[PDB]
């Protein structure tokens, strides 16, 4: 599991939280807790007012007229889910949102986006939502009676790209998917088309450099192609991701977030210049071998 970095990455409130399962002869507070867990997960921790509470699907779940899987399906078919996530977003953003909500994980490969977008355009949003719900992964993870939940831990049949893209999608326990730095932009278009992985930046509070997002162009690549040769005498190279540089000003600082590859011997100086600048280090990744 995730133990040491759980507090930093926000995994710990989901580490001590067990999956919510409705028993076959369930109590009323069990149905209410399934309702609350579904409204937190499927609607992505958005604030839900009483006007949009979806009383019909709640009432069908409360007497067992529908299951938890059918309740998740109903609240994903609803106009509230569509106006939260579908109508004002790119289709890749919608696909990764449905993956985070209904399956609790980030999309793995480009082929999943291909399948879901082709099925949406071929058969619409409801058909696509049904495909997330009627997936083998949904049954081996949640089935019929368990509310979907975020799956940060390693399971059978996952991919390690999904672990990094999960924190590209999950931005903290105090956070909703609509309330993130890319306001409507899909976070995995350049990560799934290029099949690349950006470094995991944790949420706010625990991580001072929480606000690093990469630009659409002019980004330093992750691996140092070249090694120590442009830097003279060096041993190891590290990509430092730096957030919120504002001490010199606009002529000097054009971009708040800067990613640079620096050696060991320049590491102290680089760290010192970040501190002097007032910048925040998001992550440091070993760029060379």
């Amino acid at each position: 599991a995730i133990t040491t970095a759980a507090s930093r990455l926000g995994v710990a409130p989901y580490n001590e939280s067990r999956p919510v399962e409705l028993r076959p002869d369930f109590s009323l507070d069990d149905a209410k807790m399934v309702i609350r867990a579904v409204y937190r997960q499927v609607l992505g921790n958005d604030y839900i007012m009483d006007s949009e509470r979806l009383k019909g699907a709640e009432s069908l779940l409360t007497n067992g007229s529908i299951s938890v899987r059918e309740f998740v399906r109903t609240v994903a078919k609803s106009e509230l889910y569509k106006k939260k996530f579908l109508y004002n977003n790119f289709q890749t953003r919608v696909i990764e949102l449905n993956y985070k909500h209904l399956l609790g994980r980030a999309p793995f490969s480009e082929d999943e986006v291909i399948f879901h977008l082709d099925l949406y355009e071929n058969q619409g949003f409801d058909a696509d939502i049904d495909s997330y719900i009627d997936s083998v992964e949904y049954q081996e993870n949640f089935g019929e009676n368990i509310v979907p939940y975020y799956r940060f831990n390693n399971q059978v049949g996952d991919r390690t790209v999904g672990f990094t893209r999960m924190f590209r999608l999950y931005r903290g326990y105090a956070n909703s998917d609509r309330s993130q730095l890319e306001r409507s932009s899909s976070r995995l278009a350049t990560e799934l088309g290029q099949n690349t992985v950006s470094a995991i930046v944790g949420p706010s509070g625990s991580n001072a450099g929480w606000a690093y997002r990469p630009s659409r162009a002019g980004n330093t690549p992750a691996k140092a192609l070249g090694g120590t040769v442009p830097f003279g005498q060096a041993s190891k190279l590290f990509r430092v991701e730096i957030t919120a540089i504002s001490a010199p000003g606009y002529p000097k600082v054009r971009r708040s977030n800067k990613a640079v590859i620096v050696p060991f011997e320049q590491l102290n100086q680089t760290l010192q210049q970040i501190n002097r600048l007032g910048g925040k280090v998001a992550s440091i990744t070993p760029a060379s071998l």
Partner: protein, 162 residues
Amino acid sequence: MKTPLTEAVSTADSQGRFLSSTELQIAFGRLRQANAGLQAAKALTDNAQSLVNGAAQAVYNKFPYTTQTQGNNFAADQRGKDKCARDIGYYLRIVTYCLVAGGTGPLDEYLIAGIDEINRTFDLSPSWYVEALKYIKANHGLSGDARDEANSYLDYAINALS
């Protein structure tokens, strides 16, 4: 790590409501048994070295083949005996952590969850650690409130290994 305070907060957060009178009683039970848990943890801290050595010798007496045949998983040499003393010290220290915390949370997050892969991968019999925890059960010398709380963590570590 689960604890009456942390599980109370996690539960009331799962319902998303303020701490009602239930969680106040939860922390009152925590207060009424936390002093006995701290006293038991202090007694185990003072008697820990003798307890670990005696538990290791109890395992070596109940399972003498661990001290005779060669192998990485056995205590026939000084390295294996040091590993066994370190393991029994880990078990006893996590029991003291559970006494301080007031629940099996240190056991769950540090020793219980995952010990099956430890026992299968490194060919370690859980009956050795069960006999060790039975030695701490029979020789910790606590009484009353401290005895029953400490025996709960020793049984739970025994119950997970069995």
